[PDB]
Amino acid sequence: VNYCRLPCRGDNYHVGCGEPAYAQECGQSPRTRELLKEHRNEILSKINDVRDHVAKGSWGLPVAARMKVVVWDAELAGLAKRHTKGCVGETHACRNTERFWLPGQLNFKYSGDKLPRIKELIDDAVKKGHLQKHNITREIIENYRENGGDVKELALAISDRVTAVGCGLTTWEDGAKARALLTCNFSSQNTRGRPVYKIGNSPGEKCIEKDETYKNLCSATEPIDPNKSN
Numbered sequence: 001v002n003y004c005r006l007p008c009r010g011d012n013y014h015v016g017c018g019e020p021a022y023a024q025e026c027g028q029s030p031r032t033r034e035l036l037k038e039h040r041n042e043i044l045s046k047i048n049d050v051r052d053h054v055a056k057g058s059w060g061l062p063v064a065a066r067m068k069v070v071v072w073d074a075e076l077a078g079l080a081k082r083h084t085k086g087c088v089g090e091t092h093a094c095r096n097t098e099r100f101w102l103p104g105q106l107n108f109k110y111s112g113d114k115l116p117r118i119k120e121l122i123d124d125a126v127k128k129g130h131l132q133k134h135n136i137t138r139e140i141i142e143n144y145r146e147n148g149g150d151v152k153e154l155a156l157a158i159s160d161r162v163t164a165v166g167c168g169l170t171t172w173e174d175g176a177k178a179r180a181l182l183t184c185n186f187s188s189q190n191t192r193g194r195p196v197y198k199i200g201n202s203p204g205e206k207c208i209e210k211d212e213t214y215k216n217l218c219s220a221t222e223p224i225d226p227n228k229s230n
Ligand SMILES: CCCCCCCCCCCCCCCC(=O)O
Pocket: 043, 046, 047, 049, 050, 053, 106, 122, 125, 126, 127, 129, 130, 153, 154, 157, 184
């Protein structure tokens, strides 16, 4: 699609419209960083690991009726990469696609004396999400609320409307620090006041077909509509 000709409600510019450029806010030494096959696989592995663990009713959270295995989406990743070139986490850009009408988005920021390897940047993001298990509750799962501490990152990873993810990464130097912005776009968003995922008495009880690897999740062909909410 030509993103310049894909409108969105609110009429904001689309992150994918026009030629890519680094924002002035990146300072003068930014570098977008390629997430190779190994990195993409690791991101997927950790997201599917947590989904599978939650789906069987872990952490005092409910059993999930129809939580799908997530795949990597190149288009979402390309848009996430473009976003990182701005060196700013939250913006008002549109980021819709023809397949995914309201993609969710997570932004992981790093600042430190030294720049960690790409793998360490991913590990740090995973750690942040994992530690939110102490913040999330059965209540949040039944009725999504984002502020209360943080749960946005972990909660999006375990949304049963989510079907795909794609991330990007830019690193730079400013304020006497190495900095990074790792952005992950998801096929869907959690919806305020609606369940993060639907409960079942048994994991994947409402899957047409369960996955063989992630035994508590639906397989990759599960016809979950990412543009519908709970
Ligand atoms: C790049 C980050 C992706 C989005 C954030 C990832 C969400 C947290 C992932 C936690 C995975 C580890 C938990 C798996 C369950 C377990 O082994 O106990």
